[PDB]
Amino acid sequence: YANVGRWSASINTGNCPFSFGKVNNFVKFGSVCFSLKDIPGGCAMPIVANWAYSKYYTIGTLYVSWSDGDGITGVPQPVEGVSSFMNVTLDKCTKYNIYDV
Amino acid sequence: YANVGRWSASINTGNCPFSFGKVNNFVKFGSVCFSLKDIPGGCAMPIVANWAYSKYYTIGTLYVSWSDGDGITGVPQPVEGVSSFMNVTLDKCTKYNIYDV
Ligand SMILES: *[C@@H]1O[C@H](CO)[C@@H](O)[C@H](O)[C@H]1NC(C)=O
Ligand SMILES: *[C@@H]1O[C@H](CO)[C@@H](O)[C@H](O)[C@H]1NC(C)=O
């Protein structure tokens, strides 16, 4: 969509213990699955359009379901192969995600 | 199923204030109902298969719904008729469920 007039749209957390987008920050799961048709035990994130922050419509929702644990990690950008990078900024104040801390 | 390879499966509490199996411990309801198709206001317990505790699949879910109150009790084993047993172990430390305490 275009930002025509005072229209806006977004995902919202809805009732999940994470947000769409924010799961790119090294959030971990034993298994995670998404749908545009409802899925059992899963939380739902409303795809909300609104006009002027004054009228709001759930133009759809995203249904998301997961196991806690790990083996699945959400990440900022692409990765390849067996070899894995370590990226570190020495001696400068830094925001870090080190061995899932 | 057989425990072939590292496969396992279970019910989990999901989002319920009880577990399947554990409701056999004298848990009480005004009404309770179960389904394999979704039911309104009810919590859902995921029927999870997993491999090696490392990949997990909701092979189904159990949907469960209830009223609080009583007249329905979950119990360990069968019962019959109008007459009801009292089973007590005097003078030895014991785990008890006495008049729903
Ligand atoms: C480390 O992260 C920064 C963030 O932009 C990126 O520019 C850089 O390419 C990364 N280094 C490696 C080795 O991936
Ligand atoms: C009392 O509970 C024990 C637990 O195993 C059982 O073996 C016994 O038969 C019970 N007694 C009665 C009267 O049901």
Side-chain angles (χ1 to χ4, degrees):
Chain A
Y1 58 90
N3 290 330
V4 57
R6 299 200 282 169
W7 285 103
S8 295
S10 59
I11 316 300
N12 304 163
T13 55
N15 70 301
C16 302
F18 50 89
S19 182
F20 200 82
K22 290 290 185 176
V23 292
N24 298 340
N25 299 322
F26 305 93
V27 187
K28 278 166 60 192
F29 305 102
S31 176
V32 65
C33 309
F34 301 93
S35 179
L36 299 180
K37 307 189 194 178
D38 192 14
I39 69 193
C43 60
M45 289 176 171
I47 306 171
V48 179
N50 90 68
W51 175 92
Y53 297 96
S54 299
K55 300 188 178 182
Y56 297 76
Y57 313 90
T58 57
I59 55 162
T61 65
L62 177 72
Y63 308 96
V64 67
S65 62
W66 73 102
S67 178
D68 294 340
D70 54 11
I72 315 299
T73 307
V75 300
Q77 280 304 289
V79 293
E80 174 275 315
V82 182
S83 305
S84 190
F85 55 76
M86 172 184 79
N87 201 1
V88 170
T89 301
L90 301 178
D91 291 289
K92 189 185 296 179
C93 199
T94 291
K95 179 165 59 180
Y96 62 72
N97 191 292
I98 287 161
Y99 300 124
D100 185 26
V101 180
Chain B
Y1 58 90
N3 290 330
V4 57
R6 299 200 282 169
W7 285 103
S8 295
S10 59
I11 316 300
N12 304 163
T13 55
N15 70 301
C16 302
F18 50 89
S19 182
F20 200 82
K22 290 290 185 176
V23 292
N24 298 340
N25 299 322
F26 305 93
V27 187
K28 278 166 60 192
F29 305 102
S31 176
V32 65
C33 309
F34 301 93
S35 179
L36 299 180
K37 307 189 194 178
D38 192 14
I39 69 193
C43 60
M45 289 176 171
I47 306 171
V48 179
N50 90 68
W51 175 92
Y53 298 96
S54 299
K55 300 188 178 182
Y56 297 76
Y57 313 90
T58 57
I59 55 162
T61 66
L62 177 72
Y63 308 96
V64 67
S65 62
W66 73 102
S67 178
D68 294 340
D70 54 11
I72 315 299
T73 307
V75 300
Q77 280 304 289
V79 293
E80 174 275 315
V82 182
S83 305
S84 190
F85 55 76
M86 172 184 79
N87 201 1
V88 170
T89 301
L90 301 178
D91 291 289
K92 189 185 296 179
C93 199
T94 291
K95 179 165 59 180
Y96 62 72
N97 191 292
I98 287 161
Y99 300 124
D100 185 26
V101 180

